[PDB]
């Protein structure tokens, strides 16, 4: 076979240990999921700089006045969270973030709301987005890409074991910490799903075909997205690449991918099995689950436990000039945070 006796036994034992870990992790998640609020207020923070922006608000570097600790504060304008799926998604995000615990998932510290906005205050990750490092260097070499990919595989194995789908994997959402490891943020599209779900949501280049085709879908969409991410990290551009969303969607549903001539055959094989339109064939979605990915030849050099334990030397370490340094982030237009004298949308956000 591919493995001899010692190797096959070590692998089996390793897989049983994973099951034991995930069972305990589910017990811990459920306690927090069943018992989530209002852990701070706006005037407790000095606002320093905008770190990123989206449709509903922005993420700001803030400094906690009492302790001096820096944090990333996501601010959502309650009014802009107007559409039905926007509201439900914001409640998912907060509830999931307060309940999960994993080395590659950003840690939420506080949550609160006022008349105008919702606030989630999380650990500041000063090394910047994978996105800007990738765009600056062009592409990552396969070992570098693999180091980040392994962290995503473990994070999805964790999330999916809790019946959580992530639904927005992309380099923009992956921050690099001071040891060169990844932190996933932006749980805006994450959801607890026991079987299928139906919302049309995500980022065009990363959408699985079944989302585009308005089919009820499952956690396999995250495995498709991993294929897109690995491709983009190793190529410098994603596999379905076009100027307008509708053209992107047409390429995704076609069932065709082309690879750069420098991709190894092992990498192409993995990607053809992740970027698989047929759900009966997509890696991550078969009887052996995540193990088809973790045991693939492209990951043969990966020590999964060492990655989890953060024992592996990272391919690069962002430069850090001190607490609150923002040099690894791009600049954005600053807008004053205005809080209305009248409560907005109080009934829609009661649970937050």
């Amino acid at each position: 076979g591919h493995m001899g006796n010692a190797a096959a036994a070590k692998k089996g034992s390793e897989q049983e240990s994973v099951k034991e870990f995930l069972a305990k992790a589910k017990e811990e998640f459920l306690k927090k999921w069943e018992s989530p609020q209002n852990t701070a207020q706006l005037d407790h923070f000095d606002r320093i700089k905008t770190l990123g922006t989206g449709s509903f608000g922005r993420v700001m570097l803030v400094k906690h006045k009492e302790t001096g600790n820096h944090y990333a504060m996501k601010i959502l304008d309650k009014q802009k969270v107007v559409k039905l799926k926007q509201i439900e998604h914001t409640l998912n995000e907060k509830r999931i973030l307060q309940a999960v615990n994993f080395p590659f998932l950003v840690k939420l510290e506080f949550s609160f709301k006022d008349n105008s906005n919702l606030y989630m205050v999380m650990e500041y990750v000063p090394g910047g987005e994978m996105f800007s490092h990738l765009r600056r260097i062009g592409r990552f070499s396969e070992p570098h890409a693999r180091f980040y990919a392994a962290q995503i595989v473990l994070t999805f194995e964790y999330l999916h074991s809790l019946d959580l789908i992530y639904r927005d994997l992309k380099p923009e959402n992956l921050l690099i910490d001071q040891q060169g490891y990844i932190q996933v943020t932006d749980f805006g599209f994450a959801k607890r799903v026991k079987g299928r779900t139906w919302t049309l949501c995500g980022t065009p280049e990363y959408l699985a075909p079944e989302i585009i085709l308005s089919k009820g879908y499952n956690k396999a969409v995250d495995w498709w997205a991993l294929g897109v991410l690995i491709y983009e990290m190793a190529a410098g551009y994603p596999p379905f690449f076009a100027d307008q969303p509708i053209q992107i969607y047409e390429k995704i549903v076609s069932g065709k991918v082309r690879f750069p001539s420098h991709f190894s055959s092992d990498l192409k094989d993995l990607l053809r099995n992740l970027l698989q339109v047929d759900l009966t064939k997509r890696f991550g979605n078969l009887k052996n689950g995540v193990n088809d990915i973790k045991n693939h030849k492209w990951f043969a050099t990966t020590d999964w436990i060492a990655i989890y334990q953060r024992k592996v030397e990272a391919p690069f370490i962002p430069k850090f000039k001190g607490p609150g340094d923002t040099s690894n982030f791009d600049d954005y237009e600053e807008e004053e945070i205005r809080v209305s004298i009248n409560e907005k949308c109080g009934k829609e956000f009661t649970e937050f």
Partner: peptide
Amino acid sequence: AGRTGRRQAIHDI
């Protein structure tokens, strides 16, 4: 040709 800048999510395509 395709999108090289930051990509926004869509909440309901």
